[PDB]
């Protein structure tokens, strides 16, 4: 039940079949509810010396994958009547053979708007809709139900189904792809179309506030300012911008008589608090002073 692929068998290249399962089977797959892949037949070679294949009750496994295995393994003419079930393999699967292409792509820092080719199966009634998948994907080493568009006419109408992605982190790469949800009809089924995986990177925007800043003076002239980076940089940080400004002395200090006996001059539950700091974090969405643009550093 737990397996979606047999690819974990990374180096398996031979099954000899010197011993076989009853009915002379060297490879037998029965009642694997989530199995979608055997091996990636574009990369993996597997040889089966003797014996047949048995496949029953693999609802997510396309018959094409099984037929590819027969081709790869050299088992092609070995299977007899009902060794591989036609009705219990792939019956519940995405065996999209056709290609949907994106007609339109638009970024916002928080949003992605997409359009894509309209798909219409033979009996268009059989189109249940579209399905858009997106995940945050930092490396390109890689759910929404979209109602079917407005059918009846086809002259000059952008019946391009689309979707506005709204959640999204800014300056973030998204793996995205669309699929057609259809009806396994009473005849030679229509498998439909899926788009390929496209990556889309949201726009950046203004960075979060620099965190935990500390101001110290080891010297009579030096100030050592240190800080941690914004909790939400929303982009590749270029620099930090520090301004300093000398504060004038307390006006009133020049007009107090300090010989007047009052000469004290200045010698110049945890998860309720956690959520508190976090509340304002979440609430947080000409003249010239001496400044400095701090590059590739978190101190000044």
């Amino acid at each position, epitope marked *: 039940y737990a397996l979606v692929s047999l690819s974990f068998f990374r180096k398996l290249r031979l099954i000899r079949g010197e011993t076989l399962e009853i009915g002379n089977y060297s490879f037998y797959a029965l009642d694997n509810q989530n199995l979608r892949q055997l091996w990636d037949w574009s990369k993996h070679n597997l040889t089966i010396t003797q014996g047949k294949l048995f496949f029953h009750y693999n609802p997510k496994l396309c018959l094409s994958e099984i037929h590819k295995m027969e081709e790869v393994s050299g088992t092609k003419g070995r299977q007899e009547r009902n060794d591989i079930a036609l009705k219990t393999n792939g019956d519940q699967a995405s065996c999209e053979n056709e290609l949907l*292409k*994106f*007609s*339109y*792509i*638009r*970024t*916002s820092f928080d*949003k992605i*708007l997409l*359009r894509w*080719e309209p798909y219409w199966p033979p009996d268009f009634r059989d189109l249940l809709g579209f399905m858009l998948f997106y995940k945050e994907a930092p490396y390109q080493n890689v759910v929404v139900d979209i109602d079917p568009p407005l059918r009846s006419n*086809d*002259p*000059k*109408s*952008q019946n*391009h189904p689309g979707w506005l992605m709204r959640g999204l982190k800014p300056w973030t790469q998204y793996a995205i792809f669309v699929k057609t949800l259809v009806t396994f009809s009473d005849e030679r089924r229509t498998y439909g179309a899926k788009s390929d995986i*496209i990556y889309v990177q949201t*726009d950046a925007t203004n960075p979060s506030v620099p965190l935990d800043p500390i101001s110290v003076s080891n010297s009579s002239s030096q100030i050592i300012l240190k800080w941690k980076p914004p909790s939400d940089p929303n982009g590749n940080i270029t620099h930090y911008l520090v301004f300093w400004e000398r504060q004038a002395e307390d006006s009133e200090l020049f007009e107090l008589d300090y010989c007047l006996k009052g000469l004290k001059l200045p010698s110049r539950k945890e998860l309720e608090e956690s959520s508190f700091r976090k509340t304002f974090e979440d609430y947080l969405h000409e003249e010239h002073r001496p400044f400095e643009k701090v590059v590739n550093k978190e101190s000044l």
Partner: antibody
Amino acid sequence: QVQLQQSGPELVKPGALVKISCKASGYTFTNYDIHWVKQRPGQGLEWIGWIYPGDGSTKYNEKFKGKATLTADKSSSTAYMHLSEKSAVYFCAREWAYWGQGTLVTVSA
Amino acid sequence: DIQMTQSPSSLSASLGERVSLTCRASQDIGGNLYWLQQGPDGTIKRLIYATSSLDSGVPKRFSGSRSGSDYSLTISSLESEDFVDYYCLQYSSSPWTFGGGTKLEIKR
């Protein structure tokens, strides 16, 4: 029928500001981006920016940042562009699939 | 920004000639390319979306392809109405950018 009906031609005095319209028909104005392009006589096309009418959300090309301002009137299903030189044609397009007729803006005293 | 380098600037051809235009992208546009046609009226029509997908009622003589960073618009057999201006447009990233354009002339 998806249609984008434009304004003009606009004959304006130098230094005056001008507002051009793009009236949408045949679709839900709210749900699709309106893009604007500039074309100098005999030259090529240039992207100005876009606006999402439903959201009022906008995005500009750096080279038009202050020169153009995109607005939309959901109640009228019209997109507008207010500008700040010499002749230039301005186009309106619904996600590049449907184009307006183009408005001719001539600057002369 | 992604620069779309469109060649040739002009192309003289005759009725019935197969011709092609090319757009070379600065950066990978992953097939997010459109082809626009602009007539003498100044009216722009989108012909192709997604590199090779033909828009509705765009004659079957128009076609698109890609090989590497080079994207092409091919007109299998020119008809009089085709001797206009063409521009490509990338929609891969943030500032949508166009090719310089190509003007079709009748060779005489």
